[PDB]
Amino acid sequence: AESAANTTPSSHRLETGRVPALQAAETGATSNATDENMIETRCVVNRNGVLETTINHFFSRSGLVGVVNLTDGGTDTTGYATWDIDIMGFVQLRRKCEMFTYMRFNAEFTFVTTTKNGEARPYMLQYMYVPPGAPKPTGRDAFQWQTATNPSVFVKLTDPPAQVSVPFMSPASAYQWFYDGYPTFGQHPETSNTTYGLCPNNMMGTFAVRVVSREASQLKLQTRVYMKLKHVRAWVPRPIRSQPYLLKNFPNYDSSKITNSARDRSSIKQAN
């Protein structure tokens, strides 16, 4: 259907037996009472489109995902800057994605790198994706930066932002943002269940970045990750969270200081 719905011409009824406005809500179903079984309507040929409300047009937005700092000092230097790939770091795309239970999609990661004061000097960077199980690079001159049997992107700061496409690589058939279980067997404590809700089917490796040079470069870069979902399929729709987020991998909320879903009114017998 390319349009929403057309309206049939209706009229009045004067007869017993037909009750379309007495739909019982105790059955768990939604009231199917239309306008034609009610106040007299007319013939309207609606041609309003429904294409924008689809899932592929709703999840085709990039949004901010990760912010990675790279100081590259001279005396307190590290060289590299890894970033665990997770979507729960910023509450916008998290709120947009946690309204479903199971999802399956592809990615269009984009990397925007700027300096501290803001300046595009021609410094070439190396963006490395470390899959889960591969060793992480330790140092700006490590052995792992050879990128043999490992995908990496070489780009400068004066160049346009890099953009790669990422397939679906979870060992399960779909992702999940809510895991009602435990990752392994054993006795689970009563004090602090810090492993509850953890899903090993979402650890998508680690993302590292360094500056390709010989000695050093006294510059503090700041990379931003923009992930565009595509080819997305969602299952089991879940309600939208009404409480402020507190942690990344845990949906914890405030016991006291609760936020009501609707703001307060003057009286119940007042519309304004």
Binding site: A25, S31, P239
Partner: protein
């Protein structure tokens, strides 16, 4: 409601809406109620 949040993600809406009431009183309690929708114009009606 969920329709309110979905309409909050967008900026323009159309089409008819449905509001469904449900009485959760006793079995022996009876009565009649008037649910009246009014088009735009003046403020809330004062009397029935």
């Amino acid at each position: 409601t969920l329709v309110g949040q979905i309409c909050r993600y967008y900026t323009q809406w159309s089409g008819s809406l449905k509001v469904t009431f449900m009485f959760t009183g006793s079995f022996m309690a009876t009565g009649k109620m008037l649910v009246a929708y009014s088009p735009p114009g003046s403020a809330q009606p004062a009397n029935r």
